[PDB]
Design a protein around this ligand. Structure first.
Ligand SMILES: Nc1ncnc2c1ncn2[C@@H]1O[C@H](COS(=O)(=O)NC(=O)[C@@H](N)CCC(=O)O)[C@@H](O)[C@H]1O
Ligand SMILES: [Zn+2]
Ligand SMILES: [Zn+2]
Length: 533
């Protein structure tokens, strides 16, 4: 397949900086996926941005005193710096004020309205008379009807992500003044999703996702599908005129409806013409997101995108994660419970921190970050054992082979077994970086177990008869194993992988199931200080 791969992590909301939970979720997942795809010889492009309108930015802008626009651009700068600190690369980044964006968003609404996909509905909607505003998205507080959580923003429940109508939010209240909501009639544009039930079912049946997300899609599809809000009264946003409206006629595009337009604006800038590129290159698209975005990315995004265009296939894989915890409580921008990326990530610890977030990847469970757990990983595992193998193999190559990589001679049983272990590690790495079954956590665990297998084999190498062919084989295998480690961890620790690679005399290592020998006579000198405690 010569198809290019589009990696589309969630566009972070520019109401703050990124914390380590963000990194541990869609951003490290998408960057490591991209890197493994490049290492396997594919074309891979990560599309990013903070473009769009989220009501959280408007609300944060009120409190902070700034305008929506100032606050989004300021936080976009900070988000960009944290991503670069963590080694997250991108092929395009769409800022909140991208001039070509509103045309794109408007094109999607008008094209859906004109083709009959949308409706205008009038219903009683929560309103705050003292504040003088309708109570929706981030401006309403209340409880999810499915799970009872109060971690909501109108139709979005952070805990279960199960959809529901605005009028179903339990115990609504003004999120600004606390007053219990009353009501007012309002007329808004909606996109019904229940007509699309068969298309969405079929689309998701053929998409790749893990079982936790699959079972979520089944719970969603076990009830009727709410209408997706399209328009909304708000101070900021892409304008939408609502005809024959009870309530304000001049409204805005609801953020959830913007998802398709955010994607295509990014692709348009990356390709200089998104629609020609889509039809001529037939890209594969891979989504990365946290579980609070599960409805938005498994349902609302394909629904809107697929009704707008067929120039590109809908995303073939959905790489969903749960929330990273900090000392047992979720990383939270709002609640200011966080370790911030700009403050904590340095060139010296980027590789080891990415390795640790992957070793603890909150893939199907919320998992915990503590500074203790992280520090012990660095010193005991990465230094105490990964660094140790490099040194042990390196110094014994110096001691017994004049620092040159020997050429494998004959074999015996212990070499068979170790080579077979090298094959199982290499195989885990090629498979578990795949978009279709992305599990970096298993690659790190396979690395740790492999280091221990290599520690056993060092005993075998130490006891081979000096000067013999089997002694050469053992050393060639020990080098082959370190070459395979650098191959296997490169997507997560690219600087560490590149440095071990160059000590083995290679500028790049293909990501592949077949282990390779180190070139005989290659001078072997490893650095002693890859990681920093
Ligand atoms: N503690 C945590 N651990 C692990 N992942 C976490 C996380 N907190 C957030 N996330 C995930 O990080 C992604 C971005 O988070 S976010 O800034 O709040 N923005 C949003 O959720 C939506 N505004 C994205 C809209 C879009 O994609 O266009 C989102 O995919 C979110 O799910
Ligand atoms: Zn109020
Ligand atoms: Zn819920």
């Amino acid at each position: 397949q010569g198809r290019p791969v589009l990696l589309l992590p969630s566009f972070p909301t520019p109401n703050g900086e990124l914390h380590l939970g963000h990194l541990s979720g869609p951003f490290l997942n998408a960057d490591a996926c991209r890197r493994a795809l490049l290492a396997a010889g594919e074309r891979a492009h990560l599309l990013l941005g903070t473009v769009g309108h989220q009501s959280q930015v408007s609300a944060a802008a009120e409190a902070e005193g700034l305008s929506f626009h100032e606050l989004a651009e300021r936080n976009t700068d900070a988000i960009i710096e944290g991503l670069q600190a963590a080694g997250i690369d991108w092929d395009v980044f769409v800022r909140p004020s991208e001039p070509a964006y509103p045309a794109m968003a408007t094109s999607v609404f008008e094209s859906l309205r004109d083709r009959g996909v949308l409706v205008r509905r009038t219903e009683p909607t929560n309103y705050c008379e003292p504040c003088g505003r309708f109570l929706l998205e981030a401006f309403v507080a209340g409880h999810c009807p499915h799970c009872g959580s109060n971690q909501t923003a109108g139709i979005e429940c952070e805990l279960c992500a199960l959809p529901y109508d605005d009028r179903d939010l339990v115990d609504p209240s003004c999120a600004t003044c606390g007053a219990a909501a009353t009501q007012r009639p309002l007329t808004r544009y909606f996109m019904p999703l229940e007509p699309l039930r068969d298309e969405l079912s079929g689309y998701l049946r053929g998409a790749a996702m893990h079982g936790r997300l699959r079972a979520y899609t089944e719970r969603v599809l076990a009830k009727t599908l709410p209408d997706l809000p399209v328009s909304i009264p708000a101070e900021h946003g892409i304008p939408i005129h609502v005809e024959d409206a009870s309530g304000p006629a001049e409204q805005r595009m609801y953020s959830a409806f913007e998802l398709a337009a955010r994607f295509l604006t990014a692709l348009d800038g990356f390709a200089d013409g998104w629609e020609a590129y889509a039809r001529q290159e037939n890209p594969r698209t891979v989504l990365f997101f946290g579980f609070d975005n599960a409805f938005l990315r498994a349902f609302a995004f394909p629904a809107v995108l697929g009704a707008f265009t067929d120039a590109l296939p809908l995303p073939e894989a959905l790489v969903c994660n749960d929330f990273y915890l900090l000392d047992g409580e979720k990383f939270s921008t709002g609640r200011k419970h966080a370790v911030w990326a700009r403050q904590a990530v340095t060139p010296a610890n980027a590789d080891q921190l990415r390795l640790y977030l992957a070793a603890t990847s909150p893939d199907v469970r919320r998992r915990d970050f503590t500074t203790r757990g992280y520090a012990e990983f660095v010193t005991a595992e990465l230094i105490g054992r990964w660094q140790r193998r490099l040194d042990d193999v390196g110094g014994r190559v110096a001691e017994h082979f004049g620092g040159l990589t020997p050429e494998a001679g004959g074999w015996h049983a212990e070499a068979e077994r170790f080579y077979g272990q090298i094959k199982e590690f290499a195989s885990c790495a090629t498979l578990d970086y795949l978009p279709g079954r992305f599990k970096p956590r298993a690659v790190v665990a396979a690395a740790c177990a492999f280091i221990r297998q290599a520690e056993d084999f060092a005993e075998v190498s130490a006891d081979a008869t000096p000067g013999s062919g089997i002694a050469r084989t053992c050393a060639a295998l020990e080098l082959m194993a370190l070459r395979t480690l650098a191959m296997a961890v490169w997507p997560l620790a690219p600087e560490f992988g590149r440095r071990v690679a160059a000590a083995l005399g290679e500028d790049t290592i293909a990501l592949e199931p077949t282990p390779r020998w180190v070139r005989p006579d290659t001078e072997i000198k490893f650095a002693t200080d890859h990681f920093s405690p």
